[PDB]
Design a protein around this nucleic acid. Structure first.
Ligand SMILES: [Cl-]
Ligand SMILES: [Cl-]
Ligand SMILES: [Mg+2]
Ligand SMILES: [Mg+2]
Ligand SMILES: [Mg+2]
Ligand SMILES: [Mg+2]
Ligand SMILES: [Mg+2]
Ligand SMILES: [Mg+2]
Ligand SMILES: [Mg+2]
Ligand SMILES: [Mg+2]
Ligand SMILES: [Mg+2]
Ligand SMILES: [Mg+2]
Ligand SMILES: [Mg+2]
Ligand SMILES: [Mg+2]
Ligand SMILES: [Mg+2]
Ligand SMILES: [Mg+2]
Ligand SMILES: [Mg+2]
Ligand SMILES: [Mg+2]
Ligand SMILES: [Mg+2]
Ligand SMILES: [Mg+2]
Ligand SMILES: [Mg+2]
Ligand SMILES: [Mg+2]
Ligand SMILES: [Mg+2]
Ligand SMILES: [Mg+2]
Ligand SMILES: [Mg+2]
Ligand SMILES: [Mg+2]
Lengths: 189, 99
RNA sequence: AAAUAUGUAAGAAGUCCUUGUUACUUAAUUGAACGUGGACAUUUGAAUGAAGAGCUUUUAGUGGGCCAUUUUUGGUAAGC
RNA sequence: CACGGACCAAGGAGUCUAACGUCUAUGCGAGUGUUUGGGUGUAAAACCCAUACGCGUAAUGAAAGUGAACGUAGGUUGGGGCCUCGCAAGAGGUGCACAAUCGACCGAUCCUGAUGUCUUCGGAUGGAUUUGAGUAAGAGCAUAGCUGUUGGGACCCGAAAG
RNA sequence: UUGACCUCAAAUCAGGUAGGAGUACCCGCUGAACUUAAGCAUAUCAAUAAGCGGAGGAAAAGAAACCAACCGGGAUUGCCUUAGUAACGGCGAGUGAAGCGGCAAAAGCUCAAAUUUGAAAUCUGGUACCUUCGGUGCCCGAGUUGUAAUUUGGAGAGGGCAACUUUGGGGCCGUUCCUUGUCUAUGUUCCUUGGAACAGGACGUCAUAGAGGGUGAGAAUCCCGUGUGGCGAGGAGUGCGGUUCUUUGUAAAGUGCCUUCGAAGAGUCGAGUUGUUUGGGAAUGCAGCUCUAAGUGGGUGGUAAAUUCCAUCUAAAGCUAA
């Protein structure tokens, strides 16, 4: 059962696995179904763009916080700063998320600009029903794409103050490690 | 509460322009109201005291408040709940026969 | 104290003349080890042979044996 | 004087799958993988594409952590090929891959403890019959095939049972 | 005596409703052993088969008592990945998730807890009539031991001040979809073989039709169809493209500022213990028994405890397409 110089393998097939095998024979069929469903939904919703406008947010975690992506919806504060109510925003094609909060001025200002540009690029048909026939744009994300914010200029002058970056990192670790013991010794005295 | 701008240390992290979000009303869920205070005070006078609360009052008078917390921890769950219960009994003792 | 078996050696990674390195070693430039430079070519250091020599990866079957000459144990002996 | 076989026809036993070792072929190459999905279509084909993700490009410690050039990226011995001279034989020069060996570098372990100090922090410098699946001008990623491995009915037929 | 109320009964009373079947997929309960560990009891097979209860075209889940520790993300479900990883395990055999990241699909919400108190403003049923998936009048009944309007934490409510912005409910004609009918090209011309030409040879035609089938042997052109278009018939759904009849309404909704307030779910959370289960390890979920809270409270922050902070949500009630 164990022979030769081979890696240790862990193949989890000791249950009735053959009863739960899923082969995606309908991969091509489902692609046709999704394309048909998108086409019939676009014809149903008039010239509406088939998707709602989304804000730009910072991804969490230290690993992914260097990038911005699309969030669920604009906050109540962002909607209010744009000059309209949340209820009217939902009926006009804007996603609203009540549980997200604003703590960064850069993110808040950018989402305010997105709402203002969106309002100036759409036409809202009156409730009377005359309904002038306008061409349908199938995507709002492509019309309003998300770009990573600029960080630094291409070239700049060298400014060295004589300090050491390695020394700065080492001292930062040391201060955090011994903060508790230093306070106790100071308090006991 | 300003970040240092480096990857390690006490206040590590990037420095951004800060904003103060509006307070959420859900953060005040366990806040006493005038109507709620009135009902609870009236109910205490009507219903009276629980049997385990009666013996806790005796222990406070006869064996001090330290042994009362040990018993109150047993009847209740956590020790932090025993602290609050013994505190309430002391206020009852002050307003029952002391004054 | 044999016979038969058995270890090593028969050169270039060798020999010789001169003198460089070190925290080791010596009473001591004494020694040890490793080197620079010079001298000695394949009768270059016995015989015979050499479908070439060296090296690596991977995997099959097998893991019941038996017989003959000589040496030899148990057993009266055995196709033991 | 062991077992199966009276006769004939048809059927009748190393398969497929997930994850892998060696080897070989192919594409590209410090990169490589279009097919989750989107676009498109003569419509389960063919053709086209963004962002991520996987593996590789850094190791070593239980961990906090730290992290690969004294030097033509070292010295020595052996090295195919090339270069010079020579009719040739040879001699000298240069020597990739690979083999052996002595060093240097990175992490771990055990020691030494400079300038300076939240007076206990900081750990420079120099060592050690110790240790690592490391560095030292990258080789890998993907697809396919024979062979081999493990889980699966697992080459085919067969228990007494539960 | 008489008349109510409360509770409990009867009727072949008026009108309804449940059972059984099917069960591939879906929501729960209950629950093995063969097998693997080269034996075997924990473990594994497996939270599987068998057994029982309950649905739909999907079911279930779902608008955070979430994830996180970041410059934070933001209902649920599924795919790619995380990952054969953290972790569990006679630490043996074996087992084994989750956050982030890309993508498919996207949708939000409402009760309880407030005096309408200058007027229960609410509703089943009966009956008459009518424009009949319902409407109106009238009469009993339900209901104050609470039926409507108003407010669900994102808030929001009671007063005061100043302002503008926006409509609702039906017919008919078309469109969108499905179920159907009908119409819409070109040789059977000669020679040979044969019982049969649909075979061979010669000469033509159509083609957005040379898919397929039939007819006495391999048939685009003999028949049905195929390709491309035209013309009808009957319904569903109000998704919407035009027209037309009703003013709904001293009705409704949104927005600024001042002030006072801001009710938020109990044998439940939580705790001990026992059993079961999970990758969850001083104990992941579930259940029995015992104990049993609080309101600047409560839950969580993957090592038990005391003390001091911080972060993050808002349980013990409910609905909802892809
Ligand atoms: Cl370490
Ligand atoms: Cl335990
Ligand atoms: Mg909240
Ligand atoms: Mg054998
Ligand atoms: Mg036999
Ligand atoms: Mg026989
Ligand atoms: Mg045969
Ligand atoms: Mg056969
Ligand atoms: Mg095979
Ligand atoms: Mg048994
Ligand atoms: Mg009846
Ligand atoms: Mg289920
Ligand atoms: Mg066994
Ligand atoms: Mg066995
Ligand atoms: Mg057995
Ligand atoms: Mg079953
Ligand atoms: Mg049905
Ligand atoms: Mg569906
Ligand atoms: Mg449902
Ligand atoms: Mg909520
Ligand atoms: Mg989510
Ligand atoms: Mg299991
Ligand atoms: Mg059970
Ligand atoms: Mg454990
Ligand atoms: Mg623990
Ligand atoms: Mg539900």
């Amino acid at each position: 059962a164990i022979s030769k110089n081979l890696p240790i393998l862990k193949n989890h097939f000791r249950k009735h696995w053959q009863e739960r095998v899923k082969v995606h024979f309908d991969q091509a069929g489902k692609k046709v179904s999704r394309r048909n469903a998108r086409a019939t939904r676009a014809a149903k919703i008039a010239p509406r763009p088939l998707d709602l406008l989304r804000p730009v947010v910072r991804a969490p975690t230290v690993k992914y916080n260097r990038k911005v992506r699309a969030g669920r919806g604009f906050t109540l504060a962002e909607v209010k700063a744009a000059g309209l109510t949340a209820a009217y925003a939902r009926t006009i094609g804007i996603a609203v998320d009540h549980r997200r909060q604003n703590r960064n001025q850069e993110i808040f200002d950018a989402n305010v600009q997105r709402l203002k540009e969106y309002q100036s690029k759409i036409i809202v048909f009156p409730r009377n029903g005359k309904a002038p026939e306008a061409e349908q744009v199938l995507s709002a994300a492509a019309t309003f794409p998300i770009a990573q914010p600029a960080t630094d200029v291409e070239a700049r002058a060298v400014q060295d103050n004589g300090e050491s970056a390695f020394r700065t990192l080492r001292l930062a670790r040391s201060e955090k490690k011994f903060r508790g013991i230093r306070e106790k010794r100071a308090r006991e005295k | 509460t300003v970040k240092t701008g480096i990857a390690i240390g006490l206040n590590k992290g990037k420095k951004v322009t800060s904003m103060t979000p509006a307070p959420k009303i859900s953060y005040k869920k366990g806040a006493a109201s005038n109507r709620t205070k009135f009902v609870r005070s009236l109910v205490r006078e009507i219903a009276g005291l629980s049997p385990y609360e009666r013996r806790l009052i005796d222990l406070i008078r006869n064996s001090g408040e330290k042994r009362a917390r040990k018993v109150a921890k047993k009847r209740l769950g956590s020790f932090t709940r025993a602290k609050a219960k013994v505190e309430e009994m002391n206020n009852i003792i002050a307003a029952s026969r002391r004054h």
